[PDB]
Amino acid sequence: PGLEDWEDEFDLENAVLFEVAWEVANKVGGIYTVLQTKAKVTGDEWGDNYFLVGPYTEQGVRTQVELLEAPTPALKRTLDSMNSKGCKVYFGRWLIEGGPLVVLLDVGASAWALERWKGELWDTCNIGVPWYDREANDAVLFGFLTTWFLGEFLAQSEEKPHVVAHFHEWLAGVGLCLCRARRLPVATIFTTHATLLGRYLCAGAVDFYNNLENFNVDKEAGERQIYHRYCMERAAAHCAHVFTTVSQITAIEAQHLLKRKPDIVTPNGLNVKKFFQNLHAQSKARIQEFVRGHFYGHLDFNLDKTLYFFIAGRYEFSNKGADVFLEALARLNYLLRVNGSEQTVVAFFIMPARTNNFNVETLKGQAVRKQLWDTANTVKEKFGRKLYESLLVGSLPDMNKMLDKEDFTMMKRAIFATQRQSFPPVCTHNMLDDSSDPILTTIRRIGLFNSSADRVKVIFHPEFLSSTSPLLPVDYEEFVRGCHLGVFPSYYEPWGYTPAECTVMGIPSISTNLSGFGCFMEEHIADPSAYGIYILDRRFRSLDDSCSQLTSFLYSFCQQSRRQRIIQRNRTERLSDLLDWKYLGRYYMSARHMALSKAFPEHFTYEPAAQGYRYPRPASV
Amino acid sequence: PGLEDWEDEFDLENAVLFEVAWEVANKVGGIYTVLQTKAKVTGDEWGDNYFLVGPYTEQGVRTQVELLEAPTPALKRTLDSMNSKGCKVYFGRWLIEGGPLVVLLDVGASAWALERWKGELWDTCNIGVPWYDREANDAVLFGFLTTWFLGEFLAQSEEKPHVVAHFHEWLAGVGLCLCRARRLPVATIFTTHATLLGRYLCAGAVDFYNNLENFNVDKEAGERQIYHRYCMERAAAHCAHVFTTVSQITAIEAQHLLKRKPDIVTPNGLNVKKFFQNLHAQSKARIQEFVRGHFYGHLDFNLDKTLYFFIAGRYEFSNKGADVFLEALARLNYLLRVNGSEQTVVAFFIMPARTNNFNVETLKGQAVRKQLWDTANTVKEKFGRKLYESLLVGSLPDMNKMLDKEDFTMMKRAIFATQRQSFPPVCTHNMLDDSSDPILTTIRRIGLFNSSADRVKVIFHPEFLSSTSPLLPVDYEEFVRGCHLGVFPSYYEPWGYTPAECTVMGIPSISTNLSGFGCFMEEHIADPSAYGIYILDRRFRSLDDSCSQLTSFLYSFCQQSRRQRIIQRNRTERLSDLLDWKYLGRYYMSARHMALSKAFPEHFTYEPAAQGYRYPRPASV
Amino acid sequence: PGLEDWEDEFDLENAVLFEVAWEVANKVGGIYTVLQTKAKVTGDEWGDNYFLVGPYTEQGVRTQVELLEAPTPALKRTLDSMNSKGCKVYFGRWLIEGGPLVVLLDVGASAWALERWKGELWDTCNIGVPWYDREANDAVLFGFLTTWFLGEFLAQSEEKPHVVAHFHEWLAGVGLCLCRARRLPVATIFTTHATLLGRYLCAGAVDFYNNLENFNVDKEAGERQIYHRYCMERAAAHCAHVFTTVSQITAIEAQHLLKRKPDIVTPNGLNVKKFFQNLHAQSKARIQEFVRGHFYGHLDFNLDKTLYFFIAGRYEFSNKGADVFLEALARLNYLLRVNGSEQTVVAFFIMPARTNNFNVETLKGQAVRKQLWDTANTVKEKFGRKLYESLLVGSLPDMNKMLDKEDFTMMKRAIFATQRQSFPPVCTHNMLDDSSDPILTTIRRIGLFNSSADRVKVIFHPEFLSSTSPLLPVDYEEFVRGCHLGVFPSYYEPWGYTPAECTVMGIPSISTNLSGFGCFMEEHIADPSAYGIYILDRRFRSLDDSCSQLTSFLYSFCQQSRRQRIIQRNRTERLSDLLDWKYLGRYYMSARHMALSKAFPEHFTYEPAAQGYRYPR
């Protein structure tokens, strides 16, 4: 089912959508990609009545925004006015798939108003940003500039349209609060993509989710010198016609930290066109060549029985669950050894870290694999030419005479290059702090040294995968498509971008019910594991018990036949439509309709989601 | 040196060029390609003042001509007039590289005037076409239509421009004669691409060139029922301000048959951009695979010492010198056998003949080569995988164990497919008349049966080379580029299109001083054989002595080292600029200037060629 | 589950398997491929105690058999014996995936015995071959030669092994009957791959399957001058410890024509390794380019909504159900027109027929597509170079200036080549008899002229697909992988080789419950259509009603979303393991065990199939 026909009974009444985010036209997070990929559907629903309001940055305009003249006289008039009133407001087209119009506000250009604005802010919300907080002061400037733009756009518009302003973090929350305080006619959505407290409370506290009700949010933000940022976020959530979260776990966090249950959850959709079995085969061949190089001299395990697990994303050890994955990898190593399995699990940790360079053993192993591959290819081409020559003369090859002295010299050189005594390095790079690295510390603590006995090899690649890289000449998407199972046992993950992209790429993944993507899949798929989606229970299980469940998931994945693994990959391939904005734009549409009805009930009435996007038991299981 | 700067002192005075040929926009010979490829330079020199006058044909307009409206009022007015006066004149753009404008005259549409025109013709030139000659009557219609168009274009043109009409055979010669008879102001060129008598006199008479002075052209044309066509050609040559031939041999023939020495020779140029060592290597590999298939079971000669000679073009046995080439191939076979050379010469005869289908042995040999190639590739990929696996475990391959039972079964099947007792067929096809085929008759008479003792194998391919063909999936140009030596010992060849294209493709070729291309190269290259151009002397040597000289050429080519052959191919690659219209358009320009000066000496004065296009001894020989 | 572990409790007791078929080492049918692909598993179970007894042919030995010396002294002794007794017996290795040993018998070399042998036959089975039947007389020679070889191999073998002789047609049936008549210790399997009567009765009779009980087999064979061949087949089936059929439909035919229910059905397995979505995509791109050429000037339908149905195999119009497929294609054309669908169905008929050459319009359309493709590629490379040049100078392309006069000339030439008034030809070739062709006659009768209004285009390709072909440079397997749905509504099909290979290639197929493959899938898959296997009911429905059901199948396939079609293709991809000899060799193993137990109950006891090979869904 399409997006244009969703809530088609709703008439926007020539309303104008101002989507306000600090990340509009400047990549400072993952919300930039959310806005970029959602712009297509949003502009389809709103045409040119859709404006992304961002902060002006020289890089963003240089690279992403073509500066334009306002299409309508109202926009041009407001832009000229506030440009003459001491602000520096740019208008342009964001050079992305949607081609949306962007109002960019130079917050620095209008810093002169800061003291009169933040004081004004204190006169309306009792929120006073400390001077030393650059981001909070910039948020106040951006919010006051956005509210100025909205007021001067409604004032300088004869038709006086219905304005839906959709703010996306506490950085835009100030403008939201000012829209409500000035009382100008704006239907307001507030989407929080991550509760501000949530990050600190997960990182610091031993347990954060089960203690959500037992948190003094005011006090907790107070000890961390971010009380003003917390108050800005909570006022935006409070001063919003519609409050939205990207996830149901973020919805719980916002309920217990922003003291407002989201009126709707708007999961982060994706442009699935951007992203399976033959492509997976090529990527798996490339991973297999890398593993051949990395384990040169130690290729004593069957590679056709080798499984490629990966955990990727930002190098947040506990938030991304790399600790849980490593514990489960040690337990699965024990399981595969005691069960005497011929299965091998190479688990990749693609988590960027400060690295000096590629480890010498890693680069040497890649060189050794290249040499053996070239030697085998040269000897194979010589053998093929000689064999074709022999068969052309009706002669059966005499294999003893097929290879000459030069072939044996090349092959003996290759074999000499093969010998190694040291085990393959756990990490592919030179860590600036090997002792303090959580992944390497955990690996050396649990006993995963890529030994021959270890059925689980661990390859920590503390750097993003790039095609230009010498070690792995593969970008992240192709490597992932070559893997068997993404493992993202995240503890704190308001939305799982890495597991979501893994799923869109058709790779079975392990997420958690503590992650937004994991909750979204758990509530959209009847039997997620059937579809390649393992939802680890991290809310209601201890870290040790969650490690046990992850080991169970990894072991059951290892114990699948190749036929079962293929069936499961086909199902996860089917799952990609859930994560497309063509479905997840429904929730943004309904949030905007809800806000319009709340702010303008006389003009709009809202009639309350996953219809056509439910995945029951696969018919074939 | 470029063409725009040639005779740049000449000012055309807004003259208009009408190039008249029966082959304008209808491929009925090789002059079609001459006009097509010359149109680019002609339009560069004349812009839109250049018109190709052809006969209208439904196929030509359907495929090649976009019908247009006359760009100038004069053209539109004349077209409308003569379209209202009982003719059917189309105007359009010929969809070729030059994009020239074409005036197409439907000769059938104006056949009503035939009797009053041919009678009128008899009133001006005493030439009366017999009714039964379809081509001669069509030529009279086309000539009268062209002269009508020229008269009505000069009449319906206020400026009264200087019209250069360049007619290209006796088919346009009638219009030329009428232009001169009506005395309308037209500077006329007549190019003859082949004397009409020349064809019959070469085909019938035992010796034609040495008897040129001893020919009664009137009587000779009389016995052949083509006296009117001969008179049309001779009147066109006589009634032309400039008379032109494509070759100096054609110039001699025209002097002794049309009784006029050409005022200039205009060699057939070529669009050399359309067409060397790596491309030659790929084509030679493809020819080698074909020869492996064709000689399956008989591949007892060194293929790295095998030379690929070819003769191509129309299947005219004596005119193309296939008899001389076959005699020289028998003599070269004797030379290579008595000298005990390991050199092999596979001579290809690409001369289309009525063929039922591919010979069974030929298609079977190609299938056998495909099977052996696939078997060798499969066993080679298995060997390469096993060898890479063995070298990855630091193990040297045990060649006895490398190939399995299935590899040996596949290879034994291949070897079984290899066995054959019959020698490889001389012809690749099923000739409808094997007994009457001159090439096959000569091959069986001289003893070239593709036996093992024969150092010269002969492959007659009595059909054009096509990529779509199953036997050879190669077009003519790629096959030729894979060959070592084109052999075109033509007796009658007003221009050598096949040797010229062979040279442009950078292949050393044997032509004759009886061919236009051979004469052109002989007069443009100081040492033609140094440049890969062997000029057989067929004017002043008997057929037997010319066969001896061709055997000497073939043997000296065979006796070149690979280094000498490479040097010679580099030089023939250099020769391509002689055959480009960027040089050979000079002669057409000078012919048009000469005609303008002759017809309008008051307005134009002509100042009398190969400067910058003479090739002395290569600096390196 | 594997084949080595199937009935592993059974011990062969150093038994020797002689698999006797006229098609051993000489391709004279589809049983040749059955034996060739089954040889691997059979030799895995029997090692070198497995012999494929065939008729010697010069071509077969030249191409497929490496002549060898008998590995065992018993084999060498028997070979030398019967080579010295006026017969010519070759021993070798068949150069196939299994590398089995073949005892090839030159029946011509031993024709001297024919008259006495066929006398002996009449003295033992009352079967007398008429002199004029070359195949039946060769069958008698081959059977007597096989029984001679078996008797001399058991006699010239001190251990006296347990010999399992598995004969495969009525051509080997004579040898089977003689094995039983001489009473020599041979455990005999008879597999019939197609009842001899059934082939004649499917066509000649008004309707064959519903009249099986109402057939006088003796009389019916008599009218067709094949009574001796019928009696040979029926005696082989009768004189067999185990009787086997390749299908349950063949089992019914054998019950009602050979008067013996098969003791087991041994479906024709296949070497599935020899044969899905990216490969399908490439093949579908090739088919789409062919359709672009074929329908040049008439490409007014969405090709992303175009479905490629095909029917392939031997050009038996009624047996292969091409009539039913064409009727259903006309009905589906009506359905897609009245429903105003943008779906297009190009149905290919890959059924070889006597063709003079490629039709002029067809070759011209392929040339036009090649020219347009080359023109588009040339203009695209020029545009790409100019666009890269413009972007390298920081300049946005001026699209008006991007294409030059030469580009427009090339494109205008291409467009000129595009125009055509005649509709795309229904057939790609020049039929030697257009009026006599059943497919073309039916197409012109039902109104499928590849018109613009027709939502169903029909391309009859009356020739095998070859890569060497100029028209379609794709072999049969790649073309099929590019198709959406194989349609094999066969009436007579003892085993569906074409639908089976279709399924192994991961392409959904329509078969019938009158086909062996269709019955096999219907009894192995709970919901066959879910797996891309549509079983048309042709036993219990009239030809018109079967046409209606086929139209329903085709229409429901057309009405699947691309998601549903992908799911269905994934399931049919799963189905390939059912058709592998790794599973279907189980039935041959159990038939051989059953025959061993029947002939040697003292030495062997048989303990009775699809376990691990049933598909719930």
Residue numbers in the entry:
A (entry chain B), B (entry chain D): 13 to 287, 293 to 625, 630 to 642
C (entry chain A): 13 to 287, 293 to 625, 630 to 638
What does the paper say about this structure?
Glycogen is synthesised through the cooperative action of three enzymes: glycogenin (GN), glycogen synthase (GS) and glycogen branching enzyme (GBE). Here, we report the structural and functional analysis of the full-length human GS-GN complex and the cryo-EM structure of phosphorylated human GS.
The 3D reconstruction revealed a tetrameric arrangement of human GS in agreement with the crystal structures of the C. elegans GS and yeast GS enzymes, with root mean square deviation (RMSD) values of 1.1 Å (between 484 Cα atom pairs) and 0.9 Å (between 522 Cα atom pairs) respectively. Density for the C-terminal GS interacting region of GN allows for model building of residues 300–332 (human GN34). The N- and C-terminal tails of each GS protomer lie almost parallel to each other, and travel side by side along the GS tetrameric core to reach the centre. The C-terminal tail from chain B continues to travel further across the regulatory helices than chain A, prior to traversing away from the core. This allows chain B to engage with the regulatory helices α22, specifically phosphorylated S641 interacting with residues R588 and R591, which come from two GS protomers to form a positively charged pocket we have termed the “arginine cradle”. Interestingly, these “spike” regions were present in all the refined classes, and suggests that GS exists as a continuum of structures with a core inactive tetramer and “dynamic spikes” buttressed on either side, thus preventing GS from adopting an open, active conformation. Each human GS protomer shows a closed conformation of its active site, and a regulatory loop that only becomes ordered upon G6P binding is disordered in the human structure. However, our EM density maps show no extra density within the G6P binding site.
